[PDB]
């Protein structure tokens, strides 16, 4: 750094001492210490650090009351299970599981994203949701752990609500096969919990991130992120999770996916191919 | 003129010369050193050069620096020999420049992680392979093209793609980067090649030795793709100052030599006049 | 009546309709011509079966269209906003009459 | 419409119209279907340059027509004059959109 | 007390790479573990033609 | 291929300077095939003599 003495500018050293962890601290640490640091400028200096490592409570809200429509398809996001401090975990692995009560009406599942360390509901079966017998289901959501086996549990009530309408005769299996707006919403793909596919409409500003397309969910599929739900089977959201080729003026995503496109963009995930054209 | 590959060829054809070469190599890598020196001052290995873009340049330089005894300047082991829109268009209408151009671009414009901007060593390898086997009327036209406004200067700055290769998270010490470049074989030889052809002069009218613009331009562009790889400082239309990615900070009492080492790139009238006269 | 082969043409980037905001010009190789004496017994029999409507009324092709064999690999350029782009498989390298 | 691939048929020899005088039946294969998942960046550039009329007004192809890749070897039969006849390359063996 | 071959996969038969396959048919036992083995060579022969557009999944629908 | 373009143009082998047209029959696969020759006594003769075999542009149909 440059310091002034008598209207001049001389330079001197500003040493920075920072304090760095060495391993993943577990939850069960409930300690505090004082650390002493010698500094030798070969003049002999001493430093101190009051460190306090406080443990973490892992309890959850007890009942997650929610619903699901009857028209939904397989692998459709419903709800989020998480600790009270979602975005606080950095180096502690927290996994989520389910335990069905009747053990006969298995319909849903939970996978955990390690970014937020949180689980997402997904429809696993269509027939069990289709039955009028398993209409109000009670699950024991058990929040587990990997390093130290402290865990907890909670209630999941879900209501099977609505009616069921068959899809059209020439429907494909993914939402992104459609190209115009009408054929997107008049047919149902795979990932949507609404049973129909959603259409987002972009702009005419050249190669943009705002590319007009047909997605299952306009908050999930063209998100720019390929989460744990979409990466299970590659028919759900091809425009966020593919490893393939793109025909048209565009720019691909940083690990994968379409980062920006031009015109309308559809995708054949059976051939790992995408097209972008107005 | 005998290069070091053929000097090793004539060295391996004899028994006394190979014995004294391996003797001095076991000495470096009293009386055993001095006798080998006074013998091998008459060797074909003595005063052997290398070539630019030759086959097995690395072995030639490893042989040449093997006989070298263990300092600001060193001897070069080589043979002492819109506008930028039009330069890119003249490249893309030829087939050899287009293929290697798209090669180094499609390598160096690949972001991997949100932290890692690009891969360093593959980008340097692609830039070296570009600037070795392309005819110099194409490289010098794209790297040195006269501009009048900011956008032309920005295209000229973005030509070696400094977003991957040139810039880093910090500007380290120039002397440390010089030590790193002089550790490696190739970078030290290219730096000595730049020092032998691009000093300033008080006798010649262009401040360049032998009044040779071509040797200084080839010694400049031969440093691309190493850790001491220079580029422009900004998008100035007329102000042309090249610099490596370092600074004078952290110098201690070695500040004057750091300033004098940096003035070779920042304040060289020889190199700037060569670039200006090539732009004319 | 000219043989089908390479034809070259210098074109703007923004005139290619790929939406890249740039004004550089690259060379473009395309396949052009007319295939006349390339009809085979396959071609004649398939044409006659179209004339007799034994077919199942689908999309068939009974004329040998002249297409590229292998394309060029990569063409890279820079835009109007200082950002490179790398287009794969832009022009052709070989023209064959299949 | 359907994707492009092999389709079988069984047709008479004299129904090929080639001048043969026989009534035996051969297994004629052909390539059929539609090309909608095979257009490339070359195709879009060629279509746009046809739109801007920069072309030299020749015969080009901006829709990839589905042709056979290879062909079958031989067809051997006999006719009304009791004479053997072998014809080369009557049907296809592999289909691809080119 | 005899075994019957059945096609388990279509795609592996569809590949032109796995055209001549060599299996070790091992004849085992339950009570006393005397066993034996033998060779199985199979050739993937013919061509492939797609089916029709409105086909069902079983033969007996027609 | 047609009759008019055969005689309104001159090939190589004819001493008349124009090409000759012989016209066949509709009796199936015959020796009497309609064609355009240099000479109707020399080119579709069924024999490849010493004159026609010098350079292969004269009489390709023999
Ligand atoms: C940590 O230790 C203190 C010691 O008194 C105790 O009071 C506290 O309850 C402990 N933390 C937890 C989460 O139990
Ligand atoms: C600091 O380092 C010097 C150099 O070894 C040593 O002599 C001196 O004792 C050190 N200071 C202390 C407090 O040990
Ligand atoms: C750190 O701990 C010591 C222990 O008593 C205490 O005296 C000191 O005030 C603490 N530091 C701060 C900043 O409170
Ligand atoms: C620390 O935790 C992170 C969290 O995912 C894990 O990826 C990493 O491997 C752990 N490292 C150690 C040394 O425990
Ligand atoms: C979904 O169902 C399948 C089949 O019933 C089962 O194998 C799988 O484990 C289920 N998913 C979860 C997360 O349990
Ligand atoms: Ca997504
Ligand atoms: Ca004859």
Author numbering:
A (entry chain E): 338 to 379, 387 to 622
B (entry chain C): 37 to 65, 75 to 115, 121 to 131, 159 to 357
C (entry chain A), D (entry chain B): 100 to 197
E (entry chain Y): 461 to 522
F (entry chain F): 523 to 584
Quote the study that presented this structure, word for word.
Signaling through RET plays essential regulatory roles in the development of the nervous system and kidney. The structures show that the extracellular region of RET adopts a ‘C-clamp’ shape, which is stabilized by extensive inter-domain interactions as well as binding of calcium ion at multiple sites.
Surprisingly, our cryo-EM results reveal that two 2:2:2 NRTN/GFRα2/RET complexes can dimerize to form a 4:4:4 complex through a novel ligand/receptor interface. Subsequent 3D refinement yielded a map at 4.3 Å resolution, allowing us to build a complete model of the 4:4:4 complex by rigid-body fitting the atomic models of the protein components into cryo-EM map. Particularly, the loop connecting CLD4 and CRD (residues 507–513) in RET makes a number of interactions with the surface of the major β-sheet in NRTN. Several charged residues in NTRN, including Arg101, Arg106, Glu107, Arg128, and Arg155, contribute to the interaction. 3D classification result of this mutant complex clearly showed that the double mutations in NRTN exclusively abolished the formation of the 4:4:4 complex, but not the 2:2:2 complex, verifying that the novel NRTN/RET interface is responsible merely for the formation of the higher-order oligomer.
